[PDB]
Curated annotation (Swiss-Prot):
It is found in: Cytoplasm. It is an enzyme of class 3 (hydrolase). Monomer. The gene is rnhA. InterPro entries: RNase_H, RNaseH-like_sf, RNaseH_domain, RNaseH_sf, RNaseHI. This is Ribonuclease HI.
Amino acid sequence: LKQVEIFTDGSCLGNPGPGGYGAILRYRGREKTFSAGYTRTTNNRMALMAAIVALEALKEHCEVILSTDSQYVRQGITQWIHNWKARGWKTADKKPVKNVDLWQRLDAALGQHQIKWEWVKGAGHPENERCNELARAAAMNPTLEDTGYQVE
């Protein structure tokens, strides 16, 4: 029943390089912000983190409208994540899946709520733009290591 709105964005100075994520959780006008910067990561991983952090902050089952502009997240959600799960998370050749640590973590957070995904594109909402600013700000002041990132 509880309805919330989530906005997310990932940002990276390189590929790989210093990056950050920015997310906003809005409930009844009220707002909650999330951001963190990593010394060496990818925009894809940051895009996943933004959604993961905002979703895991929820303390009850909620109806969520999650807005993101990541094409990487879109494909996983609407296409890959399904096949992966039903195959112990394997690729075309029974191999491990890239960023499984985040995809599994995100997959879990999704099963916790009824998510309605809005795949935008700066639908450039002011919120997504603000998340980008939070992400970029974090990328410019990294404080953590992205241990889950497999170089290259």
